[PDB]
Structure 1
């Protein structure tokens, strides 16, 4: 019994309540059609993932709040904030999929590729962001942690946008970018692109909902959860190329799109001058033959083997960090995450 698997059904049943509430703007019929589009956008975009971000809010809330203080209303609010993290994710996916020229995401066609959508998806993305603060207001405005949450969601959006900015600056389309594919850069991107919103946001949200706002207590959780995010994104980079797309649900574009991948960084640290030139001639181009040559060089440098060795050392390191920095929180908050992202 994973604490996630158990709390999942109740979380998904709540979604209908989220949608019913964000569409009922019933005293405003003039915008009826727009609420219909909003409903379509949520059903397509916020559904069909494993929900691990939002569930993490709901799990962590159960582990942190004295069970006497778990009234039906307090639960609603945890389900909602969890959903708020999912909406945040759906905002970044919809928009990132346009920017990266993605085909597919979680097994179906990307929202912007659906006929009759295209660049209108920009506006659709923006609405998904809007919906967060509409829910925080409708469910948490009388709560003492309300402002803390609003500030947490916006700070998380700013840091992800900063991370996306680095990702894009490091990966100019059409140009040879290998010079700027460094470890220092790589760590910076993933810290800001992924780690803050995927790991810190959901735990931090639950922490606040439990009246734990201590600056040192948020610093210490952050110190664990950012390293968890670093490993997670390194695995996302690994699976972008070597994953099984009946599992990953998406096609890898990192080579064609010219991304500062963990893989390309590792490959640069190991290449002969000769191998550098294979990579230089083949990386960052839409041609299937050139993406194949890169995968072949990665496999010749046994990077999948280097990834397996990093997944080992990372697990040990992360565990040593939960020793150092979990207290006073139940270690189970952290361990439940580690269980979910190391197979």
Structure 2
């Protein structure tokens, strides 16, 4: 798996070579700089998942070119990721990303990052064309990536309406709403997309199979994010900033369901300010509501429920496809 990871990373150089072949040379040079800064330095889990799932699904239809297409579509997933991140960082006014200055914050990039991010998106379909245009699943993959982009965008919109950074409102933060943001903004592209892509590459194109896989994978994405929000605040540290940013965090959502009217007010006064004594006091209200424990409870039920989902909906894909993801997430 750490070995697969370095093969996946080593293939990047070729991705960049093929995307970067007279007077537009300067544009293409800037494209290369954008690729290199923004598509590298994550953990590569989403793109890798394409490759791993592709191997588990397919073994005597794995010639070097099949493999090369799998690495490439994995790279397409990472590019879609990069597009989202560069754009989200600008929208959120973030400072850092992946251990570096966010791209838009580099001197001389600024809002030109909007176009750079568009270029990252565009690169997905260039690669798909270059490597997959002859394949029976080509159109299936173009449509998967487009639908993933739309779901992710539509979730981002929902998020932005829900949690405007700099304006405290908690009547927006409902369970139904939290779950809707996670599904659209995060789970579809992070969980469904990579396995779905691998399924199509493997010839598995049926609506029912895809719907079966989606059921499991969206539910995994919900836990993954819920765990993310818990760890943001209670992890062993990268200290998080979710309460400082008026996020629609699973933590705050539970808080609000579980709170007396006096506690509602303690949240009103401290959710969103930058002051560490103000951040200290929501955290302590979360501890007073035993939210680490509700999470622990939540993690157990969620795990049971996922395995029931896999039991029920995995067939006829190898359960291992799902289990390896469950393994990674439920760590």
**TM exceeds 0.5?**
yes
Structure 1 residue 305, shift from structure 2 partner = 2.3
Given that 1:100 and 1:253 are in contact with CA atoms closer than 8 Å, whether structure 2 keeps it comes out as: no
Deviation at 1:251, TM superposition (A): 5.5
Deviation (angstroms), 1:112: 1.6
Query: Offset at 1:105?
Result: 1.9
29-38 or 212-221, larger mean C-alpha shift: 29-38
Please, which runs of 5 or more residues in structure 2 have no aligned partner? none
Tell me by how many angstroms 1:170 deviates.
Answer: 0.8
Contact 1:104 1:251 in 2 (8 A): no
- The CA RMSD measured in Å over matched residues stands at 1.5
Output one character per residue of 1:98-127: Cα deviation in whole Å (capped at 9) or x when no partner: 112222222222222222222221111111
Cα distance, 1:56 vs. partner? Answer: 0.6
Distance in 2 of aligned mates of 1:201 and 1:182: 26
Residue in 1 that maps onto 2:116:
124
2:83/2:121 contact within 8 Å kept:
yes
Alpha-carbon shift at residue 331 of structure 1 (Å): 0.2
How has the CA–CA distance of structure 1 residues 305 and 108 changed in structure 2, closer, same or farther, with 3 Å as cutoff?
Answer: farther
Q: Does 1:92 align with 2:84?
A: yes
Alignment TM-score, normalising by the size of structure 1? 0.93
Deviation at 1:244, TM superposition (A): 4.3
Deviations along 1:193-221, one digit per CA (max 9) or x if unpaired, are 11110011000101010111111111100
TM-score, structure 2 length as denominator?
A: 0.96
Q: Identify which of 7, 18, 26 aligns with 1:10.
A: 7
1:52-91 deviation digits (Å, cap 9, x = unpaired): 10111001110111x1110001111000000000000111
The CA distance in 2 between the partners of 1:99 and 1:316, in whole Å, is 37
| Larger displacement relative to structure 2 (159-168 or 251-260) | 251-260
Name the stretch that deviates more: 305-314 or 156-165: 305-314
Residues 119 and 241 (structure 1 numbering): CA distance in 2 closer, same or farther, change over 3 Å? farther
CA-to-aligned-CA distance 1:19-41 (integer Å, 9 cap, x gap): 01100xxxx82112211211111
Contact 2:166 2:245 in 1 (8 A): no
For 1:35 and 1:296, the matched residues in 2 are separated by 51
Once the two structures are superposed, the pairs formed by residues 25-40 of structure 1 within 5 Å of their partners are 29-40=22-33
Q: Does the CA contact (< 8 Å) of 1:97 and 1:110 recur in 2?
A: yes
**C-alpha distance in 1, partners of 2:105/2:252?**
28
Residues 54 and 86 of structure 1 are in contact (CA less than 8 Å); yes or no, is this contact kept in structure 2?
Answer: yes
Per the alignment, in what secondary structure is the counterpart of residue 178 of structure 1?
Answer: coil
Aligned pair in 2 of structure 1 residues 240, 120: CA closer, same or farther (>3 Å)? farther
- Does the 8 Å contact 1:78/1:206 carry over to 2? yes
Would you say the 8 A contact 1:87–1:129 is kept in 2? Answer: yes
**Structure 1 segments unaligned to the other structure (5+ residues):** none
2:239 and 2:34 mapped to 1: Cα distance? Answer: 22
